[PDB]
Amino acid sequence: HMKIDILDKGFVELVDVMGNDLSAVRAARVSFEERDRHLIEYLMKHGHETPFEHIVFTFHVKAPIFVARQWFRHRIASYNELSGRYYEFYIPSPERLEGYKTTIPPERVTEKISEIVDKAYRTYLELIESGVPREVARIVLPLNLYTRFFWTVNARSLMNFLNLKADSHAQWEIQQYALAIARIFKEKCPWTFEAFLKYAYKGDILKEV
Amino acid sequence: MKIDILDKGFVELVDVMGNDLSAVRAARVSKDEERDRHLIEYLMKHGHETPFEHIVFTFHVKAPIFVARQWFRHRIASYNELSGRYSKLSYEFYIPSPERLEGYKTTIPPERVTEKISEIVDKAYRTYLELIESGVPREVARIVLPLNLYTRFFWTVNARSLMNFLNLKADSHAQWEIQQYALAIARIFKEKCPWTFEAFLKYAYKGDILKEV
Amino acid sequence: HHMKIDILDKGFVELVDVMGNDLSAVRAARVSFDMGLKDEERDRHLIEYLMKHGHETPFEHIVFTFHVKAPIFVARQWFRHRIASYNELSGRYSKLSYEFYIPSPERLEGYKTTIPPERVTEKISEIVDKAYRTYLELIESGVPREVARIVLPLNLYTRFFWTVNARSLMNFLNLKADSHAQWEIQQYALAIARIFKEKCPWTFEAFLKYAYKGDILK
Amino acid sequence: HMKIDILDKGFVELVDVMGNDLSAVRAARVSFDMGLKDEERDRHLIEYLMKHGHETPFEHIVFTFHVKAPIFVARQWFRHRIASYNELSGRYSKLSYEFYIPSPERLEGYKTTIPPERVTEKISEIVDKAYRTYLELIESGVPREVARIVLPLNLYTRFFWTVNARSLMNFLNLKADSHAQWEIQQYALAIARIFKEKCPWTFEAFLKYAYKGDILKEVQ
Ligand SMILES: Cc1cc2c(cc1C)N(C[C@H](O)[C@H](O)[C@H](O)COP(=O)(O)OP(=O)(O)OC[C@H]1O[C@@H](n3cnc4c(N)ncnc43)[C@H](O)[C@@H]1O)c1[nH]c(=O)[nH]c(=O)c1N2
Ligand SMILES: Cc1cc2c(cc1C)N(C[C@H](O)[C@H](O)[C@H](O)COP(=O)(O)OP(=O)(O)OC[C@H]1O[C@@H](n3cnc4c(N)ncnc43)[C@H](O)[C@@H]1O)c1[nH]c(=O)[nH]c(=O)c1N2
Ligand SMILES: Cc1cc2c(cc1C)N(C[C@H](O)[C@H](O)[C@H](O)COP(=O)(O)OP(=O)(O)OC[C@H]1O[C@@H](n3cnc4c(N)ncnc43)[C@H](O)[C@@H]1O)c1[nH]c(=O)[nH]c(=O)c1N2
Ligand SMILES: Cc1cc2c(cc1C)N(C[C@H](O)[C@H](O)[C@H](O)COP(=O)(O)OP(=O)(O)OC[C@H]1O[C@@H](n3cnc4c(N)ncnc43)[C@H](O)[C@@H]1O)c1[nH]c(=O)[nH]c(=O)c1N2
Ligand SMILES: O=c1ccn([C@H]2C[C@H](O)[C@@H](COP(=O)(O)O)O2)c(=O)[nH]1
Ligand SMILES: O=c1ccn([C@H]2C[C@H](O)[C@@H](COP(=O)(O)O)O2)c(=O)[nH]1
Ligand SMILES: O=c1ccn([C@H]2C[C@H](O)[C@@H](COP(=O)(O)O)O2)c(=O)[nH]1
Numbered sequence: 044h045m046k047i048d049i050l051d052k053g054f055v056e057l058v059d060v061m062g063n064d065l066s067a068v069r070a071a072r073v074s075f076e077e078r079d080r081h082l083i084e085y086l087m088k089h090g091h092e093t094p095f096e097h098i099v100f101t102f103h104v105k106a107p108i109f110v111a112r113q114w115f116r117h118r119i120a121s122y123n124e125l126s127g128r129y130y131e132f133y134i135p136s137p138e139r140l141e142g143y144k145t146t147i148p149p150e151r152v153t154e155k156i157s158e159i160v161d162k163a164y165r166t167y168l169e170l171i172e173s174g175v176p177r178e179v180a181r182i183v184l185p186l187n188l189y190t191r192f193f194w195t196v197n198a199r200s201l202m203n204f205l206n207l208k209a210d211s212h213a214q215w216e217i218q219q220y221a222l223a224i225a226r227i228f229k230e231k232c233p234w235t236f237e238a239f240l241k242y243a244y245k246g247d248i249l250k251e252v
Numbered sequence: 253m254k255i256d257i258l259d260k261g262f263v264e265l266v267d268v269m270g271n272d273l274s275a276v277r278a279a280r281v282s283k284d285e286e287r288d289r290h291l292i293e294y295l296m297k298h299g300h301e302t303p304f305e306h307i308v309f310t311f312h313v314k315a316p317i318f319v320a321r322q323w324f325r326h327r328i329a330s331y332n333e334l335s336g337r338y339s340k341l342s343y344e345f346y347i348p349s350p351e352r353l354e355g356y357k358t359t360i361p362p363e364r365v366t367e368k369i370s371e372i373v374d375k376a377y378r379t380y381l382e383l384i385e386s387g388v389p390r391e392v393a394r395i396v397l398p399l400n401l402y403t404r405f406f407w408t409v410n411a412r413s414l415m416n417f418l419n420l421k422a423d424s425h426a427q428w429e430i431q432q433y434a435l436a437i438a439r440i441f442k443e444k445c446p447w448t449f450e451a452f453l454k455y456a457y458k459g460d461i462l463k464e465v
Numbered sequence: 466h467h468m469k470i471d472i473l474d475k476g477f478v479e480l481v482d483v484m485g486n487d488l489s490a491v492r493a494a495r496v497s498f499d500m501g502l503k504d505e506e507r508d509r510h511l512i513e514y515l516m517k518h519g520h521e522t523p524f525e526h527i528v529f530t531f532h533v534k535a536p537i538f539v540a541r542q543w544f545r546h547r548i549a550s551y552n553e554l555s556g557r558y559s560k561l562s563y564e565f566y567i568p569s570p571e572r573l574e575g576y577k578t579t580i581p582p583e584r585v586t587e588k589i590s591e592i593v594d595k596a597y598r599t600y601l602e603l604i605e606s607g608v609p610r611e612v613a614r615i616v617l618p619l620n621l622y623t624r625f626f627w628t629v630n631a632r633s634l635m636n637f638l639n640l641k642a643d644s645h646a647q648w649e650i651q652q653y654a655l656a657i658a659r660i661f662k663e664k665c666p667w668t669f670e671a672f673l674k675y676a677y678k679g680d681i682l683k
Numbered sequence: 684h685m686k687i688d689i690l691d692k693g694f695v696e697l698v699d700v701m702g703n704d705l706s707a708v709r710a711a712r713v714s715f716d717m718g719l720k721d722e723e724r725d726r727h728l729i730e731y732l733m734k735h736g737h738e739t740p741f742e743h744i745v746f747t748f749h750v751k752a753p754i755f756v757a758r759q760w761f762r763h764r765i766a767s768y769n770e771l772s773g774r775y776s777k778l779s780y781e782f783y784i785p786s787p788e789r790l791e792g793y794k795t796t797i798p799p800e801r802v803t804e805k806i807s808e809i810v811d812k813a814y815r816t817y818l819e820l821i822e823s824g825v826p827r828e829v830a831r832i833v834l835p836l837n838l839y840t841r842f843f844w845t846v847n848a849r850s851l852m853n854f855l856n857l858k859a860d861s862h863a864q865w866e867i868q869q870y871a872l873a874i875a876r877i878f879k880e881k882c883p884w885t886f887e888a889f890l891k892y893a894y895k896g897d898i899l900k901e902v903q
């Protein structure tokens with residue numbers, strides 16, 4: 044029952060979850076509450092990370108392909124994505140360029156991106172209408188095309204994701220997705236998430252937001 | 253759901269995320285029973301196995317170390333095991349019963365084999381306890397303990413990699429001892445994912461024993 | 466070790482390094498029985514034996530590094546193979562060259578199309594040209610590259626290194642060297658198989674005969 | 684082949700290796716649409732990658748080792764899943780009379796109410812007994828896979844290990860560390876020594892910036 048909107052048309056939604064902070068506690072003890080919290084912080088502070096592999100999430104994510112390509116680099120997880128063989132685009136708002144000294148107003152940049160999207164999309168449609176197969180015609184669509192996928196990932200792998208994506212060195216667009224993931228993660232695994240931030244999280248932005 | 257295995261072993265279900273429909277939701281990126289089972293068979297038939305990765309199990313398993321070592325070779329999974337260095341170890345060992353060996357032509361009664369194995373276990377254990385009480389640390393004293401010592405672990409595994417495990421272990425070329433664990437894993441799996449299990453047996457299962465049970 | 470195969474108009478697969486060979490698998494399998502290498506007949510026989518019974522772990526000790534140039538829509542299909550290592554050209558950090566996969570008119574064989582295949586090719590070029598010049602002007606106005614590149618189409622060429630062991634490479638071939646896979650990636654898979662054949666003749670023959678699931682490699 | 688003896692009958696032996704320090708430089712440079720530069724430039728990128736946590740470029744360096752080690756050691760080792768293993772089988776082979784017998788020096792450091800050499804002989808006695816029983820079981824037609832269960836955890840096994848440099852570093856972090864059992868520390872020292880020999884720059888940079896363990900910053 045948890046969806047977060049990201050960018051102009053994207054989202055992250057929680058599809059399912061196995062376990063909670065106690066799943067990592069059982070695993071670390073190999074047995075089927077102030078003590079439990081303490082073991083959580085204890086595991087986290089000593090980098091005993093494998094217990095956290097026994098908490099698992101499945102997300103449904105709508106994201107632009109350029110964001111998805113960074114995301115899918117995370118190999119310790121499962122993905123199923125929408126197929127372009129078998130249509131909406133991320134248009135940055137003007138604010139995206141604030142802090143940059145551009146020769147053309149931020150609003151004009153937005154418009155040019157939006158113009159290319161429009162032109163590429165119409166080329167695609169015309170190709171399809173010509174009888175060009177989809178797998179060929181879609182190649183003209185830009186990297187800001189929205190795709191969707193299911194992402195299944197354990198809490199350990201998700202921490203690693205947060206380390207590298209919830210960080211000002213990461214592209215701002217994916218950091219937004221990472222913040223949504225962290226928020227869901229915090230909801231479901233408050234003890235682990237709190238210990239993670241305190242002892243093991245390597246990025247900067249979840250300390251600031 | 254807990255199943256006894258061998259003399260002191262068990263496979264116990266701790267948790268599961270999803271069911272056959274999780275694999276359907278994922279293949280479609282989004283319930284109609286006949287259509288959804290059909291998709292299941294279609295995925296399994298054409299080897300499109302990633303959707304089954306979105307079903308996941310956690311088990312708690314108690315097994316002898318010679319069995320755990322065969323098990324732990326399956327890398328696409330998560331493990332937490334008892335140590336070893338940090339616990340005093342229980343007097344628990346797999347001693348095969350005479351039925352394990354009847355069938356084999358042996359020059360001594362099957363029962364005397366049981367007795368011989370028991371005797372050595374008992375001696376190893378005594379040595380261990382002696383070294384323990386003498387101050388030798390556990391991590392050193394336990395090296396005298398035989399491979400039939402029972403250990404316990406938590407095993408977290410998705411339905412795709414579990415199917416791989418069943419391919420390899422639910423099979424008469426695998427050691428009899430681990431076959432028995434696989435039969436219990438197959439039962440829990442069938443109970444939680446009947447459609448995936450049936451489609452697996454029908455289309456992708458490479459072993460021999462699961463279609464006998 | 467070095468090989469290079471050109472693919473599509475401007476792509477390639479280049480072999481950068483390799484560890485091991487058919488005998489690497491033979492040795493690793495042999496340790497099971499407390500044995501090492503034997504002789505050519507027996508060792509070749511063993512490779513086939515391993516392949517027939519699906520004993521795939523010994524082939525993990527054969528390892529390749531490729532340097533691949535490919536359009537993003539192909540790279541995206543390729544990078545779904547998780548049991549492997551990648552490093553790729555960055556659109557955030559580098560300024561991208563004008564290189565796009567333009568399909569030739571023949572790519573449309575057996576399709577009845579409304580406009581001549583040549584027009585499709587030229588329509589694809591036009592949109593590409595337009596998207597690219599927009600990217601350049603965004604870059605020139607001080608737009609960061611990571612934003613500017615979002616207007617670039619899926620047929621932009623990217624480059625990457627791919628390190629992959631023989632087992633995982635066989636898994637790749639089963640799925641990509643197959644007529645249900647998109648033609649463009651089938652072409653890269655053919656190049657991959659060709660290099661694999663060259664460096665591991667026995668494994669490769671054995672794979673084709675006993676295990677390979679696709680159709681295009683026959 | 685680089686082969687280093689460990690414990691009383693143990694060894695770690697380099698079988699093969701793909702790539703070198705410059706393999707990581709090449710992989711990293713592709714991000715900036717670049718290749719190799721020169722000596723002092725490329726060594727500095729190695730340091731830079733390690734200092735900032737860019738680990739993936741080190742995946743393109745790969746090693747194969749042949750390791751002989753006690754089963755209690757292999758069991759800890761094999762927990763490292765991002766690697767490839769093939770091991771001697773007690774199902775398919777008649778096992779050799781080779782067991783790890785700790786030297787008396789393994790025990791000083793600890794107060795014991797029996798002398799360390801007594802500990803050493805108590806271990807041998809149990810090994811001898813178990814091994815003789817094993818042979819007797821085999822001799823009676825007890826199949827190997829069953830007979831071997833009486834053999835103690837200190838039995839030597841052998842395996843091939845193929846592992847990339849990033850995952851080798853993870854291994855050094857965990858096993859070349861005083862918290863790991865002394866026996867496996869010793870293997871991890873040999874591993875480190877071969878690593879260092881093949882990839883001197885990656886290795887120095889790893890010690891300087893990324894290595895979490897304690898012992899490799901003191902054992903040469
Ligand atoms: C013709 C055609 C058409 C499509 C697709 C492929 C092909 C060939 N795919 C891709 C497919 O779903 C899959 O993502 C890739 O083929 C990757 O294959 P593996 O997972 O086998 O390789 P990968 O290298 O990921 O795995 C290699 C082997 O490791 C194992 N493995 C690795 N990680 C694992 C894990 N976490 N759990 C369990 N086992 C694991 C598996 O046993 C696998 O055989 C797809 N995808 C999609 O999302 N949507 C689509 O519409 C399509 N369409
Ligand atoms: C001193 C000491 C003491 C102990 C243990 C280790 C050490 C060093 N361990 C072992 C520990 O729990 C762990 O299993 C091993 O260190 C394997 O380590 P990695 O998973 O980091 O390596 P591995 O090669 O398995 O993985 C390496 C890297 O890949 C990632 N990764 C790989 N597979 C993954 C997956 N499926 N999910 C998420 N991320 C994944 C991780 O990010 C990790 O950094 C243990 N174990 C135990 O069970 N009981 C015990 O009592 C002890 N005691
Ligand atoms: C800010 C920023 C900037 C960039 C990049 C990331 C970030 C955050 N990256 C991506 C990076 O190189 C990498 O692909 C992803 O971060 C995935 O990281 P992991 O391998 O940690 O996750 P993944 O989920 O793949 O693995 C998690 C853990 O498992 C282990 N592991 C898994 N598989 C392994 C294997 N085969 N070998 C060894 N260890 C393994 C690692 O120990 C890791 O800690 C990149 N990439 C790029 O190619 N070019 C670029 O220019 C950039 N730029
Ligand atoms: C009857 C019998 C007899 C034996 C053995 C097994 C069985 C069933 N084995 C074990 C066998 O070699 C192997 O270790 C296990 O079957 C684990 O198999 P997977 O690699 O499929 O599981 P795992 O979970 O390791 O892999 C799951 C899937 O992921 C893929 N994958 C994961 N990691 C990969 C990687 N790094 N590279 C490429 N692909 C990867 C594979 O495609 C695989 O299907 C063995 N072993 C041995 O050493 N000596 C022996 O003598 C024997 N004897
Ligand atoms: O042969 C294929 C075809 C698609 N995929 C993957 C790549 C993407 O993550 C999705 C959708 O790819 P598409 O090319 O749009 O059909 O599936 C693949 O891995 N291999
Ligand atoms: O049937 C087998 C035999 C061996 N293995 C693996 C487990 C160990 O790492 C080695 C040796 O196991 P063994 O039970 O000794 O045959 O190979 C296995 O997974 N399955
Ligand atoms: O120091 C250690 C101790 C245990 N492990 C792993 C190996 C086994 O699965 C368990 C228990 O090992 P033990 O040596 O019994 O403490 O944890 C490890 O990787 N490193």
Ligand SMILES: O=c1ccn([C@H]2C[C@H](O)[C@@H](COP(=O)(O)O)O2)c(=O)[nH]1
Pocket residue numbers: 109112113114116212213214553554555556557558
């Ligand atoms: O910040 C980044 C940059 C690149 N990557 C990965 C994702 C792609 O495979 C390549 C190219 O990414 P790019 O967004 O073009 O910089 O590197 C990433 O994961 N995170």
